[PDB]
Amino acid sequence: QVAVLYQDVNCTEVPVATPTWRVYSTGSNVFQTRAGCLIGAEHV
Amino acid sequence: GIYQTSNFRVQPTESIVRFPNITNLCPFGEVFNATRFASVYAWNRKRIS
Amino acid sequence: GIYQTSNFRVQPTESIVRFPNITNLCPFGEVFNATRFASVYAWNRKRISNCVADYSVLYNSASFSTFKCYGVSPTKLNDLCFTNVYADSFVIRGDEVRQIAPGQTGKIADYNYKLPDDFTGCVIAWNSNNLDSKVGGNYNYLYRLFRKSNLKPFERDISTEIYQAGSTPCNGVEGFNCYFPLQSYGFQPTNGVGYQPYRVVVLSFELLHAPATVCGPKKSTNLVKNKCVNFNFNGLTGTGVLTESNKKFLPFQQFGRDIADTTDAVRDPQTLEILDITPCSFGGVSVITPGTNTSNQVAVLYQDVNCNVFQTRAGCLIGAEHVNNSYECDIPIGAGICASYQTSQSIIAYTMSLGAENSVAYSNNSIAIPTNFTISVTTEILPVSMTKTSVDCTMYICGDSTECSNLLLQYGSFCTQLNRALTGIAVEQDKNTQEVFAQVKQIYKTPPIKDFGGFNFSQ
Amino acid sequence: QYGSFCTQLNRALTGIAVEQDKNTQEVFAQVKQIYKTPPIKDFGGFNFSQILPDPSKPSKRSPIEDLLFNKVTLICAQKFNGLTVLPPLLTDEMIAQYTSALLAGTITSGWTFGAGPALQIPFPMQMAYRFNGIGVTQNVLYENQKLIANQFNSAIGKIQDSLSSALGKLQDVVNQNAQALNTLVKQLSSNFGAISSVLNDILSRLDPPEAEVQIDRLITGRLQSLQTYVTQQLIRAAEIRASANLAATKMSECVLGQSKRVDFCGKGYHLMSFPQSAPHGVVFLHVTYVPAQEKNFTTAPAICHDGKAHFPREGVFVSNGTHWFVTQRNFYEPQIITTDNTFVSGNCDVVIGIVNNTVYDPLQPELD
Amino acid sequence: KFNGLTVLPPLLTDEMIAQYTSALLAGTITSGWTFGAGPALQIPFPMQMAYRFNGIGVTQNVLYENQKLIANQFNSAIGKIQDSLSSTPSALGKLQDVVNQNAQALNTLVKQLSSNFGAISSVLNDILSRLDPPEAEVQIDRLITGRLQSLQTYVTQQLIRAAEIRASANLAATKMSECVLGQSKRVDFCGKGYHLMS
Amino acid sequence: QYGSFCTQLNRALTGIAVEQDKNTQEVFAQVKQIYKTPPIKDFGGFNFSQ
Amino acid sequence: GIYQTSNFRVQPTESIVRFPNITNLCPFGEVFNATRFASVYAWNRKRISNCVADYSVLYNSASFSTFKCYGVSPTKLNDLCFTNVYADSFVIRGDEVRQ
């Protein structure tokens, strides 16, 4: 398991930008942090 | 650890055209058609529309 | 404060010459056009030097070939007059043309002029149908077909014993597998519409220096110096202001260059006189201003000038006057001199001051002891973290384009060594604010009643 | 049209040039006053005439400084083709004056001249302050003041013999910087694959529109050569800055005070340092203190008697062979073991190594 | 061992640097710091600690009165460090990185020889067999310029890299003299706590 | 004809090679002699055998 | 001190040349030496591919004059082979060879 991270993104413009990538496109747990919007990790 | 791989891009989604309402016609004619000329000395640059 | 802007510059306003009389030798046209030229198989060596040059050809007549082997500002060349004229003459089929040129190596490149590179002098292969052709065939020209190939550029092939490609020796015969070591021209004016005889005589100057022989007429106007000018003397034109040449020189040493190819080679053929070229003062610039708030007054500071002007080791200060007394440094000008806005009014540049000078007495028995004290408080600002931006690499470098993903990868994954480190900067930003403030591990709280024996912490 | 490629290259070299002024200031400019030695030179035997400026020489540089200046050395005349050397902000005359101020303070105003009012005391009574800082009591100096002075005088005068025999650290920087810049001027002769290496030599042959490619080849050639020198020098200037920062620290603690680091301002215990100006650097004459002629004794943790232990105030118990003496740490000065210089603790039944011995009770003679 | 590349051994062989390490260990236990500051002396180790304890403030009676406790902790502590180095591979991380970095940078320098750099081919032989001396030449120039920049960036990286390594060597030389050849009073120079000996 | 770009890399590169020898020389070479541990190794309890 | 002056690398002793065979065994031989040759009006061809060709000839046997058309390495071939075969079959009058 991995937690992809993006630098310049919010929780809306990530999904728009083989089937595997669609899993992280929408995301069941999205965190918006300073460094960006890291995908796959749950904040506690 | 944390590693970096690539950078996701976003592509366009449409394109169009827009031009004025002007139209003429000189397909190598009005501009390029014989037009008897004078000697080399009288080579004035005539103006065309 | 003090700022810097565009510096100062000067421009020469003279370029007189004095030497022309470039002899009269005119063998250029001789090679250009003469009796029928020899065949491509055998060349003819000709050298032109110490001549008037007279670059009145190529642009003249017509046909000819391109150059692709020159510098800047073409015209009749002139100015730089090169060093040698390797005049080569021969006759080719005329249809090839591009064979003797920079590239397009076909079959003619076997043993014919390879044109290694540079080949200063280009080629003048024009069209000559009336000459070099006869109704009775007019063979004359005889060139070999192929012999081992790659016969080197400057290596004329005049020999025998044709290759005779095979598993057996030539045996000095011309029969089965034994071809002739020569190809007959055999072209007449009637046949060969595109293969009619053409005359080409290539030249090589191996340019090596501006001031040299084989020059073109100039203007012995006169000789000037000591003004920082760029007069046009022979091939060279100088740069800076001339000076006396105290260095010793010898008759076979008329060119000067130590490490930077300075124009010490002005042997002055006109009147043997070695000149020393050196640019004049460059200059500096800096604006000393008290700010657009106080007043719209300034005092320009330069870098190197021999000058209400103050002569400073850092340059010349214009607009600010030095005062014998010294103040505390406000605007650091450099070299221990600081200017400021102090009393009408004007801008004052003075000598920085260290501090008040005081001494303490003593002898074999003495000491100083305080009697009272005074608690003091002073701030000490310290940056801890900086707002970290997250700039990506593609979009910025290249937005949404079809060729965006193809040309981007030509370099590789350099964005890997670009965006990888930027995140590390961001993470380290908070680690700086975590170790600074989160020192204590338990969060305390002051008692509800503020009673600390007289001290007030409300601030 | 190539762009503002080196609109910042001048900023890099200009920034480096300006910083060097800071380096030479933060190091020597440690005092807001210029102290001067008294005309009368009587420092209890010490002879500083070999490090203080001598008025006879107009330059006003001390003999050790004079030796260093002569020791360190086209090279200086490059025909001024795009390159120049900016003079240092403060000349050696100013640097020498700064150094003399530090010497005139440490010699007279000891070190209290860098922490407020510059109180002064006699030098023999200041070396006792510094001797006390390395575990040797004050009296150890005044008994051997004549020997110490005759030992400091000769030792300081032996430095020139070493130097006159050196300055690799300073000489390397001058040579390395000169060599790095020399190749920059020597690389203009390269052709970078073009027809010729002289710009004015290839500006009358080809079409300017068609001549851009040929000249552009040299444009990208020399530009890279210039850029590498800036990058190389920019890196090296950081190396010198770290040394400059190190030098500033030494001039703030080793000289303006007595340090306690084991080996930071010399080999051995630290007493005092004397800065000396050098070309593009500084030379520190650390005055340390090293023991020798040591001897072996027998020691126990604490003397025990009458069921009552006794421990040393500041010193280590020793054994002359039949009696027990309490001596200081470094120097060997035996004393009669007395309760005044030793305290009591424990019960002597738990320690290991206790040796039975008797101490002196002063009250006995008062009741005889 | 690739083309144009070579490696030279260190000044002191590991069989020899162990000689210096052996002497320093042998001199520190039999002569404390005395050998660093003058000739070595015969000050027996059990009481030398009392000298080192006394140098931080604690009286010298603490050593002898608890010599057995001190010795066991010293032996126990030394025994435990062996396991720490061998227990995990990240202990010698700093030494590993320098070797890995240098090797990785060296590999990239050689691997750059394959890149065409805009020329027809990345081999000097085939081009001479397909390009006329002019073509070959006018195209080889674009080949050398690529390699020189690739090689030059390697030299610069070593200069940048070597400078940071020389910082540690200076610190290792200074830390070794102050820590091994004496007791350091610096709060953080010889590990957490009051320095005793290294 | 490309110039002295070739030599500068070689001479500069060798500088790091000689530098390494100077780094080790100033780290381990802290004693002017050689010391050998005594045959008997009774150190009052401490074990240096590690 | 020590100065790294130059390098002394060992040069290759020789160069070994040979072909790995590969797609080979050309039937090209059964073209010139055959029986029942066609006429001039009749047209014939024999495509040859997936083989070694092995032109040879010209410098082998007797007769078989050349045609004066070569590029690199004239009368050598090998380097230039062209992926095509055209085995035309016809007989000229015998006196129009240049025709």
Ligand SMILES: *[C@@H]1O[C@H](CO)[C@@H](O[C@@H]2O[C@H](CO)[C@@H](O)[C@H](O)[C@H]2NC(C)=O)[C@H](O)[C@H]1NC(C)=O
């Ligand atoms: C080496 O240091 C250790 C420190 O305790 C000791 O060696 C131990 O000796 C005992 C006695 O036989 C053994 O049971 C242990 O296995 C040894 N090692 C350890 C880690 O406890 C001893 O003080 C020193 N000397 C020797 C010869 O080992």
Ligand SMILES: *[C@@H]1O[C@H](CO)[C@@H](O)[C@H](O)[C@H]1NC(C)=O
């Ligand atoms: C990020 O994008 C979301 C998408 O709706 C938006 O609501 C939000 O305001 C943006 N900014 C932040 C800081 O979340």
Ligand SMILES: *[C@@H]1O[C@H](CO)[C@@H](O)[C@H](O)[C@H]1NC(C)=O
């Ligand atoms: C001007 O533009 C209009 C559309 O906006 C077009 O209908 C009209 O024909 C144009 N006028 C001309 C072509 O003269």
Ligand SMILES: *[C@@H]1O[C@H](CO)[C@@H](O)[C@H](O)[C@H]1NC(C)=O
């Ligand atoms: C302008 O006035 C003074 C000029 O010295 C300056 O200190 C102040 O901050 C400025 N104030 C405004 C409102 O511009």
Ligand SMILES: *[C@@H]1O[C@H](CO)[C@@H](O)[C@H](O)[C@H]1NC(C)=O
């Ligand atoms: C500056 O000019 C004056 C004018 O005569 C001259 O004397 C002086 O030498 C010049 N400066 C230098 C450094 O030569």
Ligand SMILES: *[C@@H]1O[C@H](CO)[C@@H](O)[C@H](O)[C@H]1NC(C)=O
């Ligand atoms: C500054 O001092 C010099 C020294 O004599 C003197 O000549 C000069 O006049 C003084 N400055 C002014 C403004 O008087």
Ligand SMILES: *[C@@H]1O[C@H](CO)[C@@H](O)[C@H](O)[C@H]1NC(C)=O
């Ligand atoms: C406090 O300082 C003043 C002088 O500033 C002195 O007169 C006074 O005695 C001091 N305080 C006391 C308690 O002496």
Ligand SMILES: *[C@@H]1O[C@H](CO)[C@@H](O)[C@H](O)[C@H]1NC(C)=O
């Ligand atoms: C004490 O004072 C006398 C007065 O002449 C002087 O000669 C002597 O040097 C002084 N002692 C010290 C230690 O300064």
Ligand SMILES: *[C@@H]1O[C@H](CO)[C@@H](O)[C@H](O)[C@H]1NC(C)=O
């Ligand atoms: C111990 O001190 C006594 C003092 O009288 C002296 O005679 C004796 O020699 C000393 N011990 C030795 C071993 O000399």
Ligand SMILES: *[C@@H]1O[C@H](CO)[C@@H](O)[C@H](O)[C@H]1NC(C)=O
């Ligand atoms: C020291 O004195 C005590 C007092 O009784 C005695 O028990 C002990 O044996 C003495 N030490 C020695 C070494 O005899």
Ligand SMILES: *[C@@H]1O[C@H](CO)[C@@H](O)[C@H](O)[C@H]1NC(C)=O
């Ligand atoms: C036809 O005869 C020739 C003449 O020797 C010989 O090569 C072979 O028998 C036949 N040709 C081929 C290609 O096999």
